[PDB]
Amino acid sequence: FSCNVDGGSSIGAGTTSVYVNLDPVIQPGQNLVVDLSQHISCWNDYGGWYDTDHINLVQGSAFAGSLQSYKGSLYWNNVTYPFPLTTNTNVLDIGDKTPMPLPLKLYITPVGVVIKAGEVIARIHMYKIATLGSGNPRNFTWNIISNNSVVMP
């Protein structure tokens, strides 16, 4: 099982930065939408649904400290959860070689410069396990980072 960000190099595990464009100006209590399907894609390294991969997002995934007061929601594979995640999400199953954009969207409600360019706004923990043998479990963390400043007069 592997993933990439913006069509980049393969990722087997670990923490990866995910840069996203945010609305440069928002008024309280305006809502920000972050479509991560436009950045993160994953695939089965064998294909043919031989050793199918099973992916879910993990309890504890949340906004990044400085934004710990923010309210939000996390859409994942046909279900919309409250964010930060208080439970593990449903399982998405991957068995094709062709990259699958993650069906993943983050809805943010903030509670001058609100968010800094280069600032981690959220950390999404993703868990993988396959079908054959032990399934070779692996952990991914997607550090969502803003490409631009977000202000709020």
Stretch that binds ligand BTG, among 18-26, 66-74, 129-137, 142-150 (CB under 6 A): 129-137
* Residue at 87: amino acid letter: T
Distances (CA, A) of 16 to 8, 79, 136: 11, 24, 20
Tokens of 124: 């999404």
Nearer to ligand BTG, 43 or 83 (CB): 43
Nearer to ligand BTG, 46 or 107 (CB): 46
* Residue at 33: amino acid letter: V
**Residues in region 65-84 near ligand BTG by CB under 6 A:** none
40 contributes a contact to ligand BTG by CB under 6 A: no
CB of 133 to ligand BTG, least distance (A): 7
Give CA 138 to chain center in angstroms. 15
Tokens of 126: 């993703």
